[PDB]
Design an enzyme around this catalytic site. Structure first.
Site, short mmCIF file in Angstrom:
data_model
loop_
_atom_site.label_atom_id
_atom_site.label_comp_id
_atom_site.label_asym_id
_atom_site.label_seq_id
_atom_site.Cartn_x
_atom_site.Cartn_y
_atom_site.Cartn_z
CG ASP A 87 -2.06 0.95 1.26
OD1 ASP A 87 -3.01 1.24 0.69
OD2 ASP A 87 -1.69 1.90 2.21
CG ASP A 93 -6.45 -4.87 -3.49
OD1 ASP A 93 -7.40 -4.36 -2.81
OD2 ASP A 93 -5.33 -4.35 -3.52
CG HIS A 144 -5.42 -3.96 0.23
ND1 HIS A 144 -4.75 -3.49 -0.81
CD2 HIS A 144 -5.12 -3.40 1.26
CE1 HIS A 144 -4.31 -2.28 -0.42
NE2 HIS A 144 -4.30 -2.12 0.91
#
Lengths: 291, 300, 286, 300
Positions: C122, C233, C261
């Site tokens: 991320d 995701d 994710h």
């Protein structure tokens, strides 16, 4: 020899109603070669398609093994699959040796009659060595190699293959867990049915694993003819016959190659993996199409 | 380090030097100190050799090569940490991927060039893990009963590595490696001489942690073995002589065929009636097969 | 003082599940504030040094599986960003990614890490990629999971996500964690939550900084990387995956179907062999 | 010969508004079928040579604005695929994108085009890149508009649209919802898709329109071919490229655009905010300076 074609097509009416044309929808065709009359699939677009595929089976299988490929690639590709003499719908001649070195000559004679060109070879079990013959000495005419659970070397020092040959048998029956047995009972009967009649070829092959060491050496010692032909290897990892040891050997041999490892899949990859094999082959055929 | 180098020297010779006549030399490396052979002509030898042992063996494995080839060649042979007379440090991993780092660190301090590597068993991968990233400093390869690929999917290697993973702590307690694993690595049980058998068993005492970690690492080091196999073409054109104990059940001809495919500049000696420990079992008779290679290398 | 203040609160923070997070907590007083970090490995420093950078609203608990199972041969370092985990939550920091990037450089310098392999998920993408953009000689390789490195202010997908109204990013956007794991995050996200709400804004609010990375991406294109993608995701599609596959000359892509994710959580201990396969490749360039 | 019958349909295709399509209708009898094409420019070869490849259900009329104005100095070649425009609609052809690229190769070699700059829109991207990826030394540069070069079977975005049009094909063909419905949502301002052009496209795509309906199926069905391109992407990356993109396109997002910006070593991007998918229609003649700018920079 045209009389020999009649013998096969007579057998197609007298002795071949059992063939399940619902899953084997392909047109039957026959060629009277000098060693005898073969039966073959040849199905595709009338153009001859993006590629021509030649599919070589093993022991005790026949071209029914490839029905998933032929059904789903005959859209854009010309699919050819051959029943060895002694097998499938082919002639069962008394005259013949059924030795692998002689089956390889039938395959060459088959290719050079039909005039197949830049062919992609799909090979399982003995269909490896038998096909590698034409790849060893006609590598100009081979577009690429599809390799599944097979080998290209003499094995007479490895007790594994030695034990399998020397054991007593009439022939190799199909079976030497994700399920207790690996075929549909539908398919298992279609193989058994083809192994009715003279089954001699099913027993010569396992003997010839040792008895043709000279011919296997004659391939292995000039393997450098093949080592730059593009290849994709699709391996049933749970096969007891051809271990990952054989797989490592090919992964060293080829410069331009890729390997698919199918865990949970055993020896008869084109059965047990079924139509999921098609996108792996089709990916390779398009990769080959850039010449 | 200096007191440890002295400690490695001063209580060395339980060794039968009448078969191991060599001058023992010691290097202080970062991981610890190592003991090695360096024997040959006083001039720059005709070719330079580095010999890498299996488990639980040590430089004494190659004594037959050193004894004869020091007529012309710089014979180097090295005891990895934990083996032979090398240090048995508390902090080292004894991981084969780390042994290859230590052999790199060793090779750079000696500054060897156009090196011919003799690889037996684990000494194969440990050697190849230098040759695959310094290939243009490596002259050639002598391959005996070894491999360079992950075997984690082969049941054959799996069972043995699992079994010795389970039994490790017991095998270390009583040295089942020299008392059992070595004896079974011969095709003629008598050829593992009573002197050699006793010499190995005397050598690999004190801490022997390295002897037990190696058979785990057959599976446990898959990532490093994978990296070697994925890089294999960095090695495919170096000349190699492959000499193979055809009675070895650990490394079958099915492994041999893989090297025969990997190396185009290669040829193979099939020692029927020889097991895994070829430098013991075939002994001095091995020496001509190394010379036949070193001639063809040196004559280019 | 500032690091001693973290020593105070972490002694009060006994809620941390030391069964799965046994690692010795360590702390640095950087110029922006006090950070908490993991530093675990052999005394040798091991075969490689790894820096592991988390996302929003996660913290270094995310990487516990890598640290736990690599620390035998490799040095694993994992950082809690300011505002997150056990790190300080200072009133004076911006919590903007372009400032986190500076803190990560400062952290790397003050620890003195060298030839690092960066692990990024991320926001741990761009923040790590910043260092690899301007010190690519000190990076051994990149482990790339579900992230990006480019301005997206024209992409409706990221625009909607940032322009949506919130206090901060909640973890889930029938479930993909244990409740042990969820509470281990949700407890850390008690207290000053501010940084969790700046991150989703900065997706647009820091377009300029994201441009700066993108327009000099050739600084990175030949660093080796392994891409490990959570294919289910919704945030980072295969559309992002293709863009990394184009950028990196020396890379491999692993596609994790059925994984969402939080690749390190949902793939767990099975991630470790994918990293080792990469570390033992990087080690031959070194 | 069949190509003379293609001239016979020209002798019945007066509907083609030559006041906006003032180009000579030319025909090549290729092996898969005859293709209609444009070839215009200076009376001996222009400063650079352009080949323009269209999308679905568009045809060479899409490029009329480029051919109209770049033929002042450049050789403009523009093509109708088999199944489209005034090209033949053979009963035996596959209409597969991966086969159109074979016909485009066969076309290029018969015309002997050299150091070509390729213009590609929608499917014209992949169809063109399937030459530039294996003949990179016969290609001088790339003009990229709203297109791609990779499999997207994992992207529910492209999957949803393709599967929907796979289901709907039987009716979408019968009633030509492609031109009547799919084309309009490819614009940011419907007033810029002129009532004249809307007729022109609809007239060109009456008759057997099988190829218009297979195209959206092939988004998924051609995955093997798209993979065989994407795995070889490095063969193209050094070719210079101009990318001109309709930012209001929902089909090919800026997330696809970032992939090309990563791929090319030498590239420039034009971001047409307020323009949709059919950039050569909606941006008309304003497009032309962006192509000229590129060709002047290509010309070293």
């Amino acid at each position: 020899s045209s009389n020999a074609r009649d013998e096969v097509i007579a057998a197609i009416h007298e002795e071949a109603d059992w063939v399940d044309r619902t899953v084997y929808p392909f047109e039957s065709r026959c060629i009277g070669l000098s060693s005898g009359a073969v039966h073959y699939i040849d199905e595709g677009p009338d153009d001859g398609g993006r590629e021509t595929l030649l599919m070589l089976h093993g022991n005790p299988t026949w071209s029914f093994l490839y029905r998933h490929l032929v059904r789903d690639l005959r859209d854009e590709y010309r699919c050819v699959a051959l029943d060895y003499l002694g097998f499938g719908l082919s002639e069962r001649p008394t005259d013949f040796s059924y030795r692998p070195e002689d089956h390889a000559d039938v395959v060459e004679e088959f290719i050079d009659e039909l005039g197949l060109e830049d062919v992609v070879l799909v090979g399982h079990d003995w269909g490896g060595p038998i096909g590698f013959s034409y790849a060893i000495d006609h590598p100009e005419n081979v577009g690429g190699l599809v390799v599944m659970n097979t080998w290209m070397w003499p094995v007479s020092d490895d007790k594994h293959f030695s034990r399998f040959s020397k054991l007593l048998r009439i022939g190799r029956e199909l079976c030497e867990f994700a399920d207790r047995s690996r075929f549909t009972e539908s398919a298992r009967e279609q193989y058994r049915a083809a192994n009715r009649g003279d089954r001699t070829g099913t027993g010569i092959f396992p003997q010839a694993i040792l008895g043709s060491r000279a011919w296997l050496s004659s391939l292995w010692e000039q393997r450098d003819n093949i080592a730059d032909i593009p290849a994709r290897i699709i391996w049933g990892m749970e096969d007891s016959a051809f271990r990952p040891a054989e797989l490592r050997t090919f992964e060293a041999l080829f410069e331009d190659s890729s390997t698919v490892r199918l865990y949970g899949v055993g020896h008869y990859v084109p059965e047990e993996f079924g139509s999921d094999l098609v996108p792996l082959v089709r990916e390779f055929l398009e990769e080959v199409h850039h010449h």
